[PDB]
Design an enzyme around this catalytic site. Structure first.
Site: not given
Ligand SMILES: COC1CCN(c2nccc(Nc3cc4c(ccn4C4CCCC4)cn3)n2)CC1
Length: 288
Positions: A11, A16, A75-76, A120, A122, A124
């Site tokens: 995403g 970034g 990673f989640l 912040d 949320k 997301q």
């Molecule tokens: C705003 O865009 C969003 C899109 C959906 N999202 C997502 N979907 C699947 C896997 C995953 N895995 C993931 C995301 C992670 C991390 C550590 C940070 N992030 C994102 C969360 C907010 C922006 C950085 C680990 N796994 N995340 C969170 C970011």
């Protein structure tokens, strides 16, 4: 970074792009955030590597190279926003809502004990796995970079979870701002609709006021002296929480009401929330 094979785009974050990637040496699968980049920021973010808790997304590495900052996270597989959307027809079962809120409060209690705020929160940046865990992502990034009006892609940064003291122009945020955000998210899980879906700073404030009552010196000492407070704010009466988050039970309504106190001094702390009776029967279900 030569050490990471990009697998797929996850995403667009506030600061970034985020990619799923594999470490070419260790084979570890990670979330790689690439920020177009300040020495004070690097100091601040690097210290987050020690802020480890089971309900905080692990920051594995901070790589500053060629005027780009890479943050390497565990990673989640999914965020709470996607799960909420996928659960729109049936809703998230209460026991899972309760488990998630319990875990998020643990995450906050930990970070707040080390005087680190998120600022912040949320849906997301709340991340879930298939075993029933939920974790807070991007903790500490707001202090390092600020929370901008628009993201790096010009997307509007949501106001929906923003505490009233921030909206009213206070420069010194306390840990209470995170409790406010989490209360808004709690309500959203329960009702399947955002609590305060404001589309401007004033719309956000007036949505808060329409539900909770326009704040005055009785409920919030000093409110009328805040930088962006105007005596011309309309005076709305407070609504009953019974109307706000049906069909949530009295323990949940009590906790939510304490998480949404106007006065940040009165607002319940994460530690105190963990002791609330709402959690007496908390369990750890596995999600759909
Ligand atoms: C705003 O865009 C969003 C899109 C959906 N999202 C997502 N979907 C699947 C896997 C995953 N895995 C993931 C995301 C992670 C991390 C550590 C940070 N992030 C994102 C969360 C907010 C922006 C950085 C680990 N796994 N995340 C969170 C970011």
């Amino acid at each position: 970074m030569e050490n990471f094979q990009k697998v797929e785009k996850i995403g667009e974050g506030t600061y970034g792009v985020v990619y799923k990637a594999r470490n070419k040496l260790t084979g570890e699968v990670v979330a790689l955030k690439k920020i177009r980049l300040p020495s004070t920021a690097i100091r601040e973010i690097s210290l987050l590597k020690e802020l480890n808790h089971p309900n905080i997304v692990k920051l594995l590495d901070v790589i500053h190279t060629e005027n780009k900052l890479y943050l390497v996270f565990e990673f989640l597989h999914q965020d709470l926003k996607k799960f909420m959307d996928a659960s729109a027809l049936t809703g998230i079962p209460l026991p899972l809502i309760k488990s998630y809120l319990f875990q998020l409060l643990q995450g906050l209690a930990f970070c707040h004990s080390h005087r680190v705020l998120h600022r912040d929160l949320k849906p997301q940046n709340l991340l879930i796995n298939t075993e029933g865990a939920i974790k807070l992502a991007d903790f500490g990034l707001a202090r390092a970079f600020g929370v901008p009006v628009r993201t790096y892609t010009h997307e509007v940064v949501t106001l929906w979870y923003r505490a009233p003291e921030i909206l009213l122009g206070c420069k010194y945020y306390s840990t209470a701002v995170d409790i406010w955000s989490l209360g808004c998210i709690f309500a959203e899980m329960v009702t399947r609709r955002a609590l305060f879906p404001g589309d401007s700073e004033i719309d956000q404030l007036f949505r808060i006021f329409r539900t909770l009552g326009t704040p005055d010196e009785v409920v919030w000492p000093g409110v009328t002296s805040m930088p962006d407070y105007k005596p011309s704010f309309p005076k709305w009466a407070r609504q009953d929480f019974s109307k706000v988050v049906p069909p949530l039970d009295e323990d949940g309504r009590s906790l939510l009401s304490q998480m949404l106190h106007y006065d940040p001094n009165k607002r319940i702390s994460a530690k105190a929330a963990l002791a609330h009776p709402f959690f007496q029967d908390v369990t750890k279900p596995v999600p759909h």
